[PDB]
Design an enzyme around this catalytic site. Structure first.
Site, PDB file in Angstrom:
ATOM      1  N   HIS A  61       0.672  -1.010   0.309  1.00 35.31           N
ATOM      2  CA  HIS A  61      -0.354   0.222   0.096  1.00 35.31           C
ATOM      3  C   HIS A  61       1.274   1.558  -0.256  1.00 35.31           C
ATOM      4  O   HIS A  61       0.413   1.929  -0.236  1.00 35.31           O
ATOM      5  CB  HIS A  61      -0.828  -0.183   1.108  1.00 35.31           C
ATOM      6  CG  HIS A  61      -0.785  -0.292   2.458  1.00 35.31           C
ATOM      7  ND1 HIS A  61      -0.029   0.902   3.163  1.00 35.31           N
ATOM      8  CD2 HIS A  61      -0.644  -1.428   2.963  1.00 35.31           C
ATOM      9  CE1 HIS A  61       0.210   0.134   4.937  1.00 35.31           C
ATOM     10  NE2 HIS A  61       0.093  -1.066   4.528  1.00 35.31           N
ATOM     11  N   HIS A  91       5.581   7.385   6.263  1.00 36.73           N
ATOM     12  CA  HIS A  91       5.691   6.613   4.720  1.00 36.73           C
ATOM     13  C   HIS A  91       4.955   7.723   3.974  1.00 36.73           C
ATOM     14  O   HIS A  91       4.969   8.495   4.932  1.00 36.73           O
ATOM     15  CB  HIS A  91       4.619   5.888   5.124  1.00 36.73           C
ATOM     16  CG  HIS A  91       3.209   5.438   5.862  1.00 36.73           C
ATOM     17  ND1 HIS A  91       3.135   5.451   7.457  1.00 36.73           N
ATOM     18  CD2 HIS A  91       2.096   6.600   4.997  1.00 36.73           C
ATOM     19  CE1 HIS A  91       2.106   6.156   7.224  1.00 36.73           C
ATOM     20  NE2 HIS A  91       1.252   6.539   6.120  1.00 36.73           N
ATOM     21  N   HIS A  93       2.391   8.737   0.842  1.00 33.55           N
ATOM     22  CA  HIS A  93       1.115   8.801  -0.176  1.00 33.55           C
ATOM     23  C   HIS A  93       1.512  10.005  -1.432  1.00 33.55           C
ATOM     24  O   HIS A  93       2.175  11.121  -1.495  1.00 33.55           O
ATOM     25  CB  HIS A  93      -0.043   9.220   0.361  1.00 33.55           C
ATOM     26  CG  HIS A  93      -0.433   8.779   2.416  1.00 33.55           C
ATOM     27  ND1 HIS A  93      -1.376   7.503   1.776  1.00 33.55           N
ATOM     28  CD2 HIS A  93      -0.047   8.517   2.602  1.00 33.55           C
ATOM     29  CE1 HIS A  93      -1.756   7.111   3.439  1.00 33.55           C
ATOM     30  NE2 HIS A  93      -0.224   7.779   3.596  1.00 33.55           N
ATOM     31  N   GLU A 103      -3.078  13.267   0.829  1.00 35.56           N
ATOM     32  CA  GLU A 103      -4.436  12.759   1.421  1.00 35.56           C
ATOM     33  C   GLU A 103      -5.208  14.241   2.043  1.00 35.56           C
ATOM     34  O   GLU A 103      -6.220  14.764   1.680  1.00 35.56           O
ATOM     35  CB  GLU A 103      -4.067  11.884   3.014  1.00 35.56           C
ATOM     36  CG  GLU A 103      -3.936  11.011   2.534  1.00 35.56           C
ATOM     37  CD  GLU A 103      -3.856   9.576   2.712  1.00 35.56           C
ATOM     38  OE1 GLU A 103      -3.604   9.480   4.275  1.00 35.56           O
ATOM     39  OE2 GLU A 103      -4.336   8.655   2.796  1.00 35.56           O
ATOM     40  N   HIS A 116       4.404  10.916   6.028  1.00 29.65           N
ATOM     41  CA  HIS A 116       3.478  10.534   7.948  1.00 29.65           C
ATOM     42  C   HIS A 116       4.236  10.464   8.329  1.00 29.65           C
ATOM     43  O   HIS A 116       4.692   9.130   7.809  1.00 29.65           O
ATOM     44  CB  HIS A 116       2.354   9.857   7.294  1.00 29.65           C
ATOM     45  CG  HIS A 116       1.332  10.232   6.782  1.00 29.65           C
ATOM     46  ND1 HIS A 116       0.001   9.904   5.980  1.00 29.65           N
ATOM     47  CD2 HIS A 116       1.003  11.581   6.894  1.00 29.65           C
ATOM     48  CE1 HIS A 116      -1.099  10.374   5.859  1.00 29.65           C
ATOM     49  NE2 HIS A 116      -0.624  11.575   5.958  1.00 29.65           N
ATOM     50  N   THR A 195      -5.652   6.192   8.057  1.00 32.87           N
ATOM     51  CA  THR A 195      -6.123   6.505   6.891  1.00 32.87           C
ATOM     52  C   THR A 195      -5.733   5.344   5.672  1.00 32.87           C
ATOM     53  O   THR A 195      -6.543   5.359   4.569  1.00 32.87           O
ATOM     54  CB  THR A 195      -5.750   7.921   6.162  1.00 32.87           C
ATOM     55  OG1 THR A 195      -4.170   7.276   6.201  1.00 32.87           O
ATOM     56  CG2 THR A 195      -5.141   9.184   6.791  1.00 32.87           C
TER      57      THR A 195
HETATM   58  C1  LIG Z   1       0.060  -2.557  12.380  1.00 32.88           C
HETATM   59  C2  LIG Z   1      -1.206  -1.883  12.886  1.00 32.88           C
HETATM   60  C3  LIG Z   1      -1.534  -2.310  14.054  1.00 32.88           C
HETATM   61  C4  LIG Z   1      -1.165  -2.637  15.403  1.00 32.88           C
HETATM   62  C5  LIG Z   1      -0.869  -1.117  14.856  1.00 32.88           C
HETATM   63  C6  LIG Z   1      -0.948  -0.859  13.383  1.00 32.88           C
HETATM   64  C7  LIG Z   1      -0.742   0.242  12.144  1.00 32.88           C
HETATM   65  C8  LIG Z   1      -0.793   1.613  12.881  1.00 32.88           C
HETATM   66  C9  LIG Z   1      -0.774   2.633  12.582  1.00 32.88           C
HETATM   67  C10 LIG Z   1      -0.316   2.603  10.794  1.00 32.88           C
HETATM   68  C11 LIG Z   1      -0.418   4.192  10.048  1.00 32.88           C
HETATM   69  C12 LIG Z   1      -1.536   3.694   8.614  1.00 32.88           C
HETATM   70  O1  LIG Z   1      -1.300   4.936   7.994  1.00 32.88           O
HETATM   71  S1  LIG Z   1      -1.798   6.236   8.531  1.00 32.88           S
HETATM   72  N1  LIG Z   1      -1.599   6.993   6.890  1.00 32.88           N
HETATM   73  O2  LIG Z   1      -2.496   7.015   9.297  1.00 32.88           O
HETATM   74  O3  LIG Z   1      -0.219   6.834   9.404  1.00 32.88           O
HETATM   75  C13 LIG Z   1      -1.480   2.500   7.791  1.00 32.88           C
HETATM   76  C14 LIG Z   1      -1.535   1.573   8.793  1.00 32.88           C
HETATM   77  C15 LIG Z   1      -0.574   1.278   9.877  1.00 32.88           C
HETATM   78  C16 LIG Z   1       0.586   0.720   9.342  1.00 32.88           C
HETATM   79  C17 LIG Z   1      -1.493   0.698  11.277  1.00 32.88           C
HETATM   80  C18 LIG Z   1      -1.638  -1.064  10.738  1.00 32.88           C
HETATM   81  C19 LIG Z   1      -1.643  -1.461  11.508  1.00 32.88           C
HETATM   82 ZN   LIG Z   2      -0.206   7.710   5.608  1.00 36.00          ZN
END
Ligand SMILES: C[C@@]12CCC[C@H]1[C@@H]1CC=C3C[C@@H](OS(N)(=O)=O)CC[C@]3(C)[C@H]1CC2
Ligand SMILES: [Zn+2]
Length: 257
Positions: A61, A91, A93, A103, A116, A195
């Site tokens: 992604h 990361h 977008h 975003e 971000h 997001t």
């Molecule tokens: C690994 C995880 C479960 C516990 C911590 C979670 C992380 C926490 C933060 C993010 C940043 C998000 O991107 S954004 N755009 O909102 O900053 C993408 C998703 C992701 C990697 C979660 C995916 C699911």
């Molecule tokens: Zn992000």
């Protein structure tokens, strides 16, 4: 299963993640004339001197640079935040063309990309527990416009050929994220969400007003990434942005006049 395509993109996410239609979803349009200057907001404290980057990863992604978050080495404090947030990863977008990719939007303006920097509140001990809390995460968002190159980004761009397809990773030590920051830490802030799935409503958003400039050659390298794995039909990793969601009952606050 979820992605950014016609059949699995943002308009579909609510089926697996019903919070997609929640009261504090991200991103949002920042209406600069409606955001309230809050003289009580503190300067943001960004302490990245002892950051330890570990890995760069294509997660299907985006791509992310991961940090050692086992100690308070790269932390965000102050601004709208209570306590100390550890940097886990950054990361991006980005778009298929320079007129989309961000975003957040500013008076409906889309930037070419958005950086971000994801941090989690040390009072919850690990990021999995922090994502279950309304003040669990702080994400620092920085807009990218296309013009002059960002020298501090080039180390990132030059390894992307090695992580072209999903799950591919590489060593990425000694990367200094201070080289990605604009001059000003003037910011907007509001309570929001991740997001991407699981779209958890755990984020204090801190969006810097000042964009960084990157070159067309730098963003072209982002657009050579693939969403697909290896051996699967090639689909360029472009337009990996969620559009602006309803603001509902929220106030965007500005740190500046
Ligand atoms: C690994 C995880 C479960 C516990 C911590 C979670 C992380 C926490 C933060 C993010 C940043 C998000 O991107 S954004 N755009 O909102 O900053 C993408 C998703 C992701 C990697 C979660 C995916 C699911
Ligand atoms: Zn992000």
């Amino acid at each position: 299963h979820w992605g950014y395509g016609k059949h699995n993109g943002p308009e579909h996410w609510h089926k697996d993640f019903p919070i997609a239609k929640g009261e504090r979803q991200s991103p949002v349009d920042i209406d600069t004339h409606t955001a309230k200057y809050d003289p009580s907001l503190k300067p943001l404290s960004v302490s990245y001197d002892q950051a330890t980057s570990l890995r760069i990863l294509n997660n299907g992604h985006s791509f992310q640079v991961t940090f050692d978050d086992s100690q308070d080495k790269a932390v965000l404090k102050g601004g709208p935040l209570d306590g100390t947030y550890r940097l886990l990863q950054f990361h991006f977008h980005w778009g298929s063309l320079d007129g989309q990719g961000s975003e957040h939007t500013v008076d409906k303006k889309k930037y070419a990309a958005e950086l971000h920097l994801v941090h989690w509140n040390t009072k919850y001990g690990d990021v999995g527990k922090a994502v279950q809390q309304p003040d669990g995460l702080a994400v620092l968002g920085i807009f990218l416009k296309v013009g002059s190159a960002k020298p501090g980004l080039q180390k990132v761009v030059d390894v992307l050929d090695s992580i072209k397809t999903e799950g591919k990773s590489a060593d990425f030590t000694n990367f200094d994220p201070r080289g990605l920051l604009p001059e000003s830490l003037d910011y907007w802030t509001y309570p929001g969400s991740l997001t991407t799935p699981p779209l958890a409503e755990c984020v204090t958003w801190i969006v810097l007003k000042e964009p960084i400039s990157v070159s067309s050659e730098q963003v072209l390298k982002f657009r050579k990434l693939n969403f697909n794995g290896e051996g699967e039909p090639e689909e360029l990793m472009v337009d990996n942005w969620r559009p602006a969601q309803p603001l509902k009952n929220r106030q965007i606050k500005a740190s500046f006049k």
